[PDB]
Each structure stands twice: as C-alpha cells, then as structure tokens.
Amino acid sequence: DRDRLRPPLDERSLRDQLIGAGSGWRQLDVVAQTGSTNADLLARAASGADIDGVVLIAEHQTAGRGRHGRGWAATARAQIILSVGVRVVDVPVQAWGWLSLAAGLAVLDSVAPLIVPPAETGLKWPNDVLARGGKLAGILAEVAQPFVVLGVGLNVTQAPEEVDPDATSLLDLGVAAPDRNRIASRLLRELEARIIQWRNANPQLAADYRARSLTIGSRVRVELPGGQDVVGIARDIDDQGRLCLDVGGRTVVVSAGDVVHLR
Numbered sequence: 001d002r003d004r005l006r007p008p009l010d011e012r013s014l015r016d017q018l019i020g021a022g023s024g025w026r027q028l029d030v031v032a033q034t035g036s037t038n039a040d041l042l043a044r045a046a047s048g049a050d051i052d053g054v055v056l057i058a059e060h061q062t063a064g065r066g067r068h069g070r071g072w073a074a075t076a077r078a079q080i081i082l083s084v085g086v087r088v089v090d091v092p093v094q095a096w097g098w099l100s101l102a103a104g105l106a107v108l109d110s111v112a113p114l115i116v117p118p119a120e121t122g123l124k125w126p127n128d129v130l131a132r133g134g135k136l137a138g139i140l141a142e143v144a145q146p147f148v149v150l151g152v153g154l155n156v157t158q159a160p161e162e163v164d165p166d167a168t169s170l171l172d173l174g175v176a177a178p179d180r181n182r183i184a185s186r187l188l189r190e191l192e193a194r195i196i197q198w199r200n201a202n203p204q205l206a207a208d209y210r211a212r213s214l215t216i217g218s219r220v221r222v223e224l225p226g227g228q229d230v231v232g233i234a235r236d237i238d239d240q241g242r243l244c245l246d247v248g249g250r251t252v253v254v255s256a257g258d259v260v261h262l263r
C-alpha cells in the first residue's frame with residue numbers, strides 16, 4: 001500500500017547537498033530509529049557537544065514529543081522527522097519565540113509548490129502547518145542553553161488513520177510520488193535562510209509569516225495552558241512572536257496555547 005511509496009532516505013546524498021561551502025549545516029545524520037530526535041540533540045548538548053548547525057533525521061520515531069507535554073505519532077518512513085541545533089545565546093531572549101515561527105514558515109515554503117492549493121493552506125499560530133484544514137506538520141522548540149533544538153514532524157505519506165484524525169499528508173493532498181530526499185533538502189535550505197533572518201531580526205520574516213498566516217483575521221478559540229479558553233479575533237503577531245487577540249475591544253496577548261479557527 002503506502003509502504004511502497006516509502007523508500008529510505010539517502011544520507012550520503014543529503015550530505016553532498018547540504019554540507020560544504022555556502023551552507024551553514026555542519027553535521028547531518030540519518031538514523032533508522034530513535035525515541036525522539038529532539039531528546040537526542042538535547043542529550044548531546046547536555047554532554048557538552050556543540051549542536052549548532054547539526055542535523056539529525058530519523059526514519060522512525062517511537063516516543064515523539066509534542067508541545068505542552070503531548071506526544072507525536074509516526075510510522076516508519078512515512079514522515080520527515082528531523083531536529084536541528086541553533087545557537088541562540090547571542091540573541092535577546094524576548095525574540096526566541098520567533099525562531100519557532102520561522103521554522104514553520106520554512107517547512108511550509110518547502111512543500112507548498114508540490115500541491116493547486118486548497119482552502120486553509122498556511123500557518124496556524126504558533127507554527128502549525130495546515131493544509132485543507134488538516135495538520136500537515138508540527139514544530140517543537142526546546143531550550144538547552146546556549147542552544148535551541150528545533151524539531152519538525154512533516155507528514156509525507158503518513159496516513160491520518162495511523163497518527164491523528166486531524167492530520168493530513170502530502171499524499172492525502174494530491175502529491176502522488178513525494179520524494180523525501182528532495183523535500184528534506186529544500187526544507188533544510190529554507191530553514192537555513194529563515195534562521196539567518198531571525199538571527200539578524202530581518203523584517204521580512206514577520207512580513208512573510210503574516211502573508212501565510214491562517215490565524216490572523218480569523219475568529220478563534222485559544223486554549224491556554226491551565227485549561228482556560230479565550231474567544232476572540234486574532235489580529236496580529238507582536239515582536240516576541242505572541243498572538244494578539246481582539247476580545248470585544250480588549251487586547252489579549254497570548255504567548256502559548258492551542259488555536260482553533262472558528263466559524
């Protein structure tokens with residue numbers, strides 16, 4: 001079935017394209033299986049390793065992490081499962097929130113042309129990559145000074161029945177034979193540019209995010225950490241990467257939470 005549409009990644013090829021002159025990526029490894037690529041890179045940094053510009057890709061992830069203590073389901077060779085290390089200590093802490101937003105924009109730009117784009121194809125705050133209403137990719141940013149580990153889970157041929165009822169994949173969107181080697185290459189290249197833009201506070205980063213946001217201008221219900229709900233209209237993203245809500249004339253700024261686009 002879908003397994004035949006899932007050939008293995010070419011580590012040697014990815015290294016030839018992404019490592020060398022003109023590229024910031026220093027190290028790239030493809031492992032057959034791990035618990036969590038985010039956990040692994042955090043473990044490396046915890047033992048003194050310099051993970052800046054280091055890429056770890058897993059064909060399969062058995063104990064995937066999600067935001068707010070949730071999980072991330074996956075089957076072998078059905079997704080692009082990677083984590084990258086980013087040195088952030090040179091950047092003010094108030095701007096670290098934009099790093100995760102930049103990541104989702106990069107993931108989206110890497111797969112957007114492969115799709116015609118149906119309704120609801122863009123970014124849901126924080127960095128949910130949505131397509132036709134379904135969650136195409138999820139991003140997780142975890143802190144390990146002086147680094148931030150950026151995690152990306154992109155559904156390539158992953159069936160929604162195998163992971164989550166609200167999930168979608170490139171295959172379920174119409175992409176017949178998605179090449180994970182091509183996509184991963186474009187992903188990390190888009191990611192490199194966005195990280196550089198974030199590090200230098202490039203205005204275009206925020207501009208490109210707004211142009212691809214599905215949340216801004218929509219009536220939403222935001223489920224805050226702690227279990228409280230806030231209903232209003234998303235208006236803008238501030239300089240810290242936080243969602244600014246219009247609640248009956250009052251401005252409510254949210255740093256973290258789950259966004260639901262309402263009727």
Ligand SMILES: Nc1ncnc2c1ncn2COCCNS(=O)(=O)NC(=O)CCCC[C@@H]1SC[C@@H]2NC(=O)N[C@@H]21
Nearest residue numbers: 036038064065066067073138140151152153163164167
């Ligand atoms: N394949 C799925 N597709 C869509 N929804 C899903 C799926 N599998 C469960 N779900 C349901 O989503 C639960 C997670 N919800 S969430 O709070 O928004 N969290 C995220 O979306 C961030 C997940 C980040 C995963 C990446 S992948 C490699 C790296 N290592 C990690 O351990 N984490 C990062």
Ligand SMILES: [Cl-]
Nearest residue numbers: 001002159161
């Ligand atoms: Cl199917």
